[PDB]
Paper text:
The best-characterised examples of unwanted immunogenicity from drug-protein conjugates are β-lactam antibiotics, such as penicillin G (PenG). As the electrophilic source of its inhibitory activity, the β-lactam group of PenG may also drive background / side reactivity with off-target biological nucleophiles leading to protein conjugation via primary amine-containing sidechains of lysine (and potentially other nucleophilic residues including arginine, histidine, and cysteine), as has been observed under some buffer conditions. Such protein-PenG complexes are the antigenic determinants of antibiotic hypersensitivity. Here, through systematic complementary biochemical, structural and clonotypic analyses of the relationship between the protein-conjugating properties of PenG and its immunogenicity in a mouse model, we now fully map the PenG-specific antibody response. We find that the ADA response is based upon a restricted cluster of highly related B cell germline clonal families that, regardless of CDRH3 length, engage the penicillin sidechain via conserved binding modes.
Next, we determined the X-ray crystal structure of the PenG-Lys•MIL-3 complex at 2.2 Å. In both H/L and A/B molecules, the phenylacetamide PenG sidechain and the thiazolidine moieties are well-defined in the electron density whilst the Cβ, Cδ and Cγ portion of the lysine moiety has weak density, indicating it is less well ordered and consistent with our observations by protein NMR (see above). The PenG phenyl group is deeply buried in a narrow hydrophobic pocket sandwiched on one face of the benzene ring by CDR L loops (Tyr68 L, Tyr110L) and the β-turn formed by CRDH3, mainly the side chain of Ile120H with some involvement of the main chain of Phe124H, on the other face (FigS10b). The interaction with Tyr68L has strong π-stacking character whilst the planes of the rings found in the phenyl moiety and Tyr110L are offset 70° and thus hydrophobic in character. The nitrogen of the phenylacetamide forms a hydrogen bond with the carbonyl of Thr121H whilst the phenylacetamide carbonyl oxygen bridges via a water molecule (W1) to the side chain hydroxyl of Tyr110L.
Author numbering:
A (entry chain L): 20 to 233
B (entry chain H): 20 to 240
Write the structure that this text describes.
């Protein structure tokens, strides 16, 4: 097939900024290249066809360009609604192939997370499993290090993270880390702690509880 | 008002078969090719199948991964586009989009989730994420619901039947080691409201016809 490579795969920009994404094909595709915007949990929206033709209704700040193998999309002045993932599509020769996509997100100031820890419910323990949940609320940038400490012992292999998309009001992220243990292992220990390292914090923050005490 | 209204899909076992449907309206369906395009969860877009108009003999083209297992077809009298999916494999699990590219537009359906697994549907367990009374007395407190061990996707979560939206984060589902999905939904509230206000998370899992309301209270000993 023809291979389509996008650059960069993700990027941040501030409102009003000029943004350019590039799209490179493994061979000449005769400007049969289309650009799509996909917002999370939504279907793709067509933006440009034949490298540079705007689909009716797309704001004029969107512009596409290129020829041969090398093409680009450009947003002259970024606006809040332009966030999402942009895909380019080669439709010269079947199979029509897409690029990996460029994630466009909005820049904002560092924000430190509010951290909360949640012990397993008694109800859940009745079934023999204990999930311990740590929440990092409303922070920026996305990178954060969360470590679980049980009776001063680091945990490995028994925790999963999940991260929301940028909040539509304050452009922050939130993250949840879920520590899973058997009820037997859970009840053999006292201090369950969540340690959060993040650029918005001068030092790591820790939230903890002792199994048993209200 | 162009629409591609999709129907079908859902949960189906490997080697099984499924038929997707797409009803077109508001453009000249018969003159244009029709397509199916896939998006595996969290991954990229991929072409599945193409079929041209009567004017081009209904020529069909397929991605290599599905060449002798899927069949694209159309009924121009009924404005219907179909994808007959046979000999299904785990890697066919994806969101499937009906797509029509026209002279000056390209229209995408809403997508139908196809999950290729032999497991039966499983409704969630909903457990409280409750704040202990350590919460800063004049600040903010967090609480939530842990929505655990369901299959397949998706679940939706609201708070107090949608009346509570501010400060809510419902996290993307996670695939656990057990092969069942799990997610949390949280909300931050004034610490002054723990005990005085009532927080109920409304969990809906359509594939299993499960609707669960869980009251989250601070906890006592
Ligand atoms: C009567 C007759 O003979 N018909 C032929 C099909 C051709 C009918 C008219 N052609 C199209 O609408 C094409 N659309 C565009 O160029 C614009 C565009 C491209 C990308 C994004 C947005 C807009 C192409 N049509 C698709 C296809 O043909 O699959 C394509 C190649 C993927 S784009 C037939 O039925 O054989």
């Amino acid at each position: 097939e023809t291979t389509v490579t996008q650059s960069p795969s993700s990027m941040y920009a501030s409102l009003g900024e000029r943004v350019t994404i590039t799209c490179k094909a493994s061979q000449d595709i005769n400007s049969y290249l289309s650009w799509f915007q996909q917002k999370p949990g939504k279907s793709p929206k067509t933006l440009i066809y034949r490298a540079s033709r705007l689909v009716d209704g797309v704001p004029s700040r969107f512009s596409g360009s290129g020829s041969g193998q090398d093409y680009s999309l450009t947003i002259s002045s970024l606006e809040y609604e332009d966030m999402g993932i942009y895909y380019c599509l080669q439709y010269d020769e079947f199979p029509y192939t897409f690029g990996g996509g460029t994630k466009l997100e909005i820049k904002r100031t560092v924000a430190a997370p509010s951290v909360f820890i949640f012990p397993p419910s008694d109800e859940q323990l009745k079934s023999g499993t204990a999930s311990v949940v740590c929440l990092l609320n409303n922070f920026y940038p996305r990178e954060a290090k969360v470590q679980w400490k049980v009776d001063n012992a680091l945990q490995s292999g028994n925790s999963q993270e999940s991260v929301t998309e940028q909040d539509s009001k304050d452009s922050t992220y939130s993250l949840s880390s879920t520590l899973t243990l058997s009820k037997a292992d859970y009840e053999k220990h006292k201090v369950y702690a969540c340690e959060v390292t993040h650029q918005g914090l001068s030092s790591p923050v820790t939230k903890s509880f002792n199994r048993g005490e209200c | 008002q162009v629409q591609l209204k999709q129907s079908g899909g859902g949960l189906v076992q490997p080697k099984g078969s499924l038929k997707l449907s797409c009803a077109a309206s508001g453009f000249t369906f018969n003159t244009y090719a029709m397509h199916w395009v896939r998006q595996a969860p969290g991954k990229g877009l991929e072409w599945v199948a193409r079929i041209r108009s009567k004017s081009s003999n209904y020529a069909t083209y397929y991605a290599d991964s599905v060449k002798d297992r899927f069949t694209i077809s159309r009924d121009d009298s009924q404005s219907m586009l179909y994808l007959q999916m046979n000999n299904l494999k785990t890697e066919d699990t994806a969101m499937y989009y009906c797509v029509s590219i026209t002279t000056r537009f390209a229209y995408w359906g809403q997508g139908t989730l196809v999950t290729v697994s032999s497991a039966s549907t499983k409704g969630p367990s909903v457990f409280p994420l409750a704040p202990s009374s350590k919460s800063t007395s004049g600040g903010t407190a967090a609480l939530g619901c842990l929505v655990k061990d369901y299959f397949p996707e998706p679940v939706t979560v609201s708070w107090n039947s949608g009346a509570l939206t501010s400060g809510v984060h419902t996290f993307p589902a996670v695939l656990q080691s057990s092969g069942l999905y799990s997610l949390s939904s949280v909300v931050t509230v004034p610490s002054s409201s723990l005990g005085t206000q009532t927080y109920i998370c409304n969990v809906n899992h359509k594939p299993s016809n499960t609707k669960v309301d869980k009251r989250v209270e601070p906890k006592s000993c």
